Design a protein around this nucleic acid. Structure first.
Ligand SMILES: [Mg+2]
Ligand SMILES: [Mg+2]
Ligand SMILES: [Mg+2]
Ligand SMILES: [Mg+2]
Ligand SMILES: [Mg+2]
Ligand SMILES: [Mg+2]
Ligand SMILES: [Mg+2]
Ligand SMILES: [Mg+2]
Ligand SMILES: [Mg+2]
Ligand SMILES: [Mg+2]
Ligand SMILES: [Mg+2]
Ligand SMILES: [Mg+2]
Ligand SMILES: [Mg+2]
Ligand SMILES: [Mg+2]
Ligand SMILES: [Mg+2]
Ligand SMILES: [Mg+2]
Ligand SMILES: [Mg+2]
Ligand SMILES: [Mg+2]
Ligand SMILES: [Mg+2]
Ligand SMILES: [Mg+2]
Ligand SMILES: [Mg+2]
Ligand SMILES: [Mg+2]
Ligand SMILES: [Mg+2]
Ligand SMILES: [Mg+2]
Ligand SMILES: [Mg+2]
Ligand SMILES: [Mg+2]
Ligand SMILES: [Mg+2]
Ligand SMILES: [Mg+2]
Ligand SMILES: [Mg+2]
Ligand SMILES: [Mg+2]
Lengths: 102, 147, 204
RNA sequence: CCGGGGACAGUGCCAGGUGGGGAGUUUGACUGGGGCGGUACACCUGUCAAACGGUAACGCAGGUGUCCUAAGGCGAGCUCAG
RNA sequence: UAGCUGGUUCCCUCCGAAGUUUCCCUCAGGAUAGCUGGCGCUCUCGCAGACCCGACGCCCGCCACGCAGUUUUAUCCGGUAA
RNA sequence: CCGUCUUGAAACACGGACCAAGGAGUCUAACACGUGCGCGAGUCGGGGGCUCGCACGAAAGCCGCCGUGGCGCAAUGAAGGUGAAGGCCGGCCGAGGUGGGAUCCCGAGGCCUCUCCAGUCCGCCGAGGGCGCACCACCGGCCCGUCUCGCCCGCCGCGCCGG
RNA sequence: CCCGGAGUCGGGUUGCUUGGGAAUGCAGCCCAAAGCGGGUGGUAAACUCCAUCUAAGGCUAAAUACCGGCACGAGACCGAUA
RNA sequence: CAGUAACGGCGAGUGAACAGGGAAGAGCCCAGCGCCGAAUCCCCGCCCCGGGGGCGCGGGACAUGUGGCGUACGGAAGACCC
């Protein structure tokens, strides 16, 4: 006939019927819980910020965010750890600007 | 057996088969493959051309399972089945062709060396040559792909 | 020195090898010692089947070996759930759970549920107190058949189903088999770059 | 404890310098002995060379590591030293 | 470790060398081709007609190929001796 | 006056007073070719397992496509990858042709018997002729890499697509 | 309703190590985390789908090794310079 | 698998893994998060068996966290069914 199941190409393989399952419970390691979110920001308001974070937030006040991305990347090491560190710190400045406008 | 070797015939002759002039020494000329560019150059160029240098692209972690493709030629294709399969297909009034799955016989590609006997056959393989799948259609058969 | 013609050999003997030589002269001694521990274990577990638990049907994992099928480490928890037996009673019955094996397909799920149910109807379960059978088996069943099974428990079949001859229809006769491989090998090769040229031409 | 220094010295890690104090190794070949001198160590012409070719020695006489948008390519017309 | 010294154990039979080419940090060594032996193989002549016996087809004439450190007959080649 | 190295040893070259005993091309691995054997498009259990109770026996036998695997049956390209049938007239045949070619086949003609006449049945020689093995040289053909020229074809995807 | 191991991961750099090749492992030193996160997906990088596992806590028999020890058995081994 | 991918004055040399087949086969435990009137452990003295058991207005450890339940294969608590 037409469209024999073929061993090369885009749609390849032996054409099997997949079952859906409840996933393995180890797949939710490191998903944020409500209670551990509450612990982790009680600590931040009682400990503050590290001096590289406190310096990187100053480069983000003056809209100098390429240099703040390069600075964070120099200190934590990886591009993807830096650009989620930056948007974390930007949510600190966006929250602190809003909380001080009132 | 040590009773059939040259050492038992060379047991009165001083040099023991290695000459008075030259001698039998330890390693006259280096050890192993020493000197293949310098003093054993003529031996490597006369007999092993290509021995020195790099050609082609490196490929780390070659996993030879994912390039497995054993081939069967087209003339050893009816040997994959019994003989009453081939014989009863020739006697058949209705045009029924038997099936030859080469994958259960351990082959993935069919190659087209040879000649087929003149009767239709359905061949199920994973791969075909161009002119292997037109020596099946000319005998009157069909090619079927299996993944 | 190379003499005239021959291979360029590279023998691996530059590394003080005759200090580390494993001879094999205790080979028939250890075929006897192993065999006397099979015979001793098989009479410790006296009707239990001499070879350990039942093992699943497992498809071999590469493109070289995926037509054959073997026995695995054990049954997955999803196979135990729908065969309806607990994961902690099953080793006490001789089933050998494997807790880290996924079930991606359905007919390999069903072939091991079918293996489990066919095993469970086949085994003979003695009671805890032989003076009082609770739920296990009838005492007539435990007498004339309580023998130990030798070899693997229901060993794994390579079943090749025989398809019969048929008539080649006209459209199956007219199937460009080489050409469909070369086009399918070309479409997957050019798939990403045609999609990029499609989305840039949406503007220009 | 009393004085005296004191965010320096110092220590740890990296970088640059110095470093026969110390380490390891090398310190061509041919050659009328070796060294010194030469290069007969890759090439080219004539001779040796014994009228096919081949033919040695630290044999003889010399050359070479370049030069050239023409000193390359065609065509035409010319004739040189004296 | 030694490309260097020294030694390397019974008998008969047959065959029997090389110190030269080319390359090498090569010149007391090796690779390389020559020279040697062994193992064969492919063919040829053929074996010769029991003792016998030159023969037995078509007046003549003829008796396989190939090969050579050789001459002959043709024919080219050379710049030594003189 | 022997061994020795050497162009060259009786040597004013070296070693050797004498006798007994010991005393030097081995074993493993990997290759190459040659030979013997078995099986043969396959071949091989080498690892494991099974078998009265282990004198010999730490042997021997057996397994089954336990053949997993090795090597062999397919090459070529760095790689994506691709991947070995013609000949004769749509039909027949199934690896082409020329030159040589052991052997085998045909064979006109001859070859005898007391004598011819006719015939018969086998033997021997045999000019020529045929089919030609292996191997050799040659010429074509096919597969893969790569060039140069060139025009067609295919479709679920009309493409910087496939052939 | 409840869900997880931090001077750790990771990054840089130096040194050893590895078949590990723009860095396989290990260590020093500096920097130093995150929580739909983190690790891995054998070519450095950005982007994005997908797969895979849950590091920085712990225990565990069997199959495996054995020129020493205790105690045995055997050998195509040696036979008193062995 | 394999003298293979790969390393290598890419020279000499070095050099694994996964799949497949066997031998053997076995799985588990905390911390944390939480609830249980610290429900826990050591020591001593007396009392019954040859450590058990039972006493002590007997000591001490321990809320800077012992025990039970419970660990990524999820778990718990409620109802409901069995
Ligand atoms: Mg010899
Ligand atoms: Mg000698
Ligand atoms: Mg010699
Ligand atoms: Mg010499
Ligand atoms: Mg087992
Ligand atoms: Mg010095
Ligand atoms: Mg010199
Ligand atoms: Mg001459
Ligand atoms: Mg002119
Ligand atoms: Mg020397
Ligand atoms: Mg000498
Ligand atoms: Mg001349
Ligand atoms: Mg003259
Ligand atoms: Mg002399
Ligand atoms: Mg002498
Ligand atoms: Mg003298
Ligand atoms: Mg001397
Ligand atoms: Mg003397
Ligand atoms: Mg003696
Ligand atoms: Mg052989
Ligand atoms: Mg190393
Ligand atoms: Mg990559
Ligand atoms: Mg442990
Ligand atoms: Mg003695
Ligand atoms: Mg004595
Ligand atoms: Mg002694
Ligand atoms: Mg004696
Ligand atoms: Mg191999
Ligand atoms: Mg090494
Ligand atoms: Mg707790």
């Amino acid at each position: 006939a037409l469209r024999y199941p073929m061993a090369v190409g885009l749609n390849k393989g032996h054409k099997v019927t997949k079952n859906v399952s409840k996933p393995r419970h180890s797949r939710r390691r490191g998903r944020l819980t409500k209670h551990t979110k509450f612990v982790r920001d009680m600590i931040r308001e009682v400990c503050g910020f590290a001096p590289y974070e406190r310096r990187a937030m100053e480069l983000l006040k003056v809209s100098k965010d390429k240099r703040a991305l390069k600075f964070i990347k120099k200190r934590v090491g990886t591009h993807i750890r830096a650009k989620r560190k930056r948007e974390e710190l930007s949510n600190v400045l966006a929250a602190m600007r809003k909380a001080a406008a009132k | 057996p040590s009773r059939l070797r040259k050492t038992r015939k060379l047991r009165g002759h001083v040099s023991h088969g290695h000459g008075r002039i030259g001698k039998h020494r330890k390693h006259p000329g280096g050890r192993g493959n020493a000197g293949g560019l310098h003093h054993h150059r003529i031996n490597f160029d006369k007999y092993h051309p290509g021995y020195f240098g790099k050609v082609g692209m490196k490929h780390y972690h070659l996993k030879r399972n994912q390039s497995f493709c054993p081939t069967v030629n087209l003339d050893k294709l009816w040997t994959l089945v019994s003989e009453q399969t081939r014989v009863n297909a020739a006697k058949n009034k209705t045009g029924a062709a038997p099936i030859i799955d080469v994958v259960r016989s351990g082959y993935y590609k069919v190659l087209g060396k040879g000649k087929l006997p003149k009767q239709p056959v359905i061949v199920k393989a994973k791969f075909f040559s161009r002119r292997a799948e037109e020596k099946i259609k000319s005998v009157g058969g069909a090619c079927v792909l299996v993944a | 020195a190379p003499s005239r013609n021959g291979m360029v050999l590279k023998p691996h003997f530059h590394k003080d090898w005759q200090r580390r030589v494993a001879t094999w002269f205790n080979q028939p001694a250890r075929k006897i010692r192993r065999r006397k521990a099979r015979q001793a274990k098989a009479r410790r577990i006296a009707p239990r089947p001499a070879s350990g638990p039942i093992r699943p049907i497992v498809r071999c994992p590469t493109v070289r070996y995926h037509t054959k099928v073997r026995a695995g480490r054990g049954f997955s928890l999803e196979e135990l759930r729908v065969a309806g037996i607990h994961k902690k009673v099953a080793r006490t019955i001789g089933i050998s759970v494997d807790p880290r094996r996924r079930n991606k397909s359905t007919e390999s799920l069903q072939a091991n549920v079918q293996r489990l149910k066919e095993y469970r109807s086949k085994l003979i379960l003695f009671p805890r107190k032989p003076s009082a059978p609770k739920k296990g088996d009838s005492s007539a069943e435990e007498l004339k058949l309580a023998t130990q099974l030798t070899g693997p428990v229901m060993p794994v079949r390579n079943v090749y189903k025989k398809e019969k001859a048929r008539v080649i229809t006209e459209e199956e006769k007219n199937f460009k088999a080489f050409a469909s491989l070369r086009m399918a090998r070309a479409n997957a090769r050019l798939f990403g770059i045609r999609a990029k040229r499609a989305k840039e031409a949406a503007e220009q």
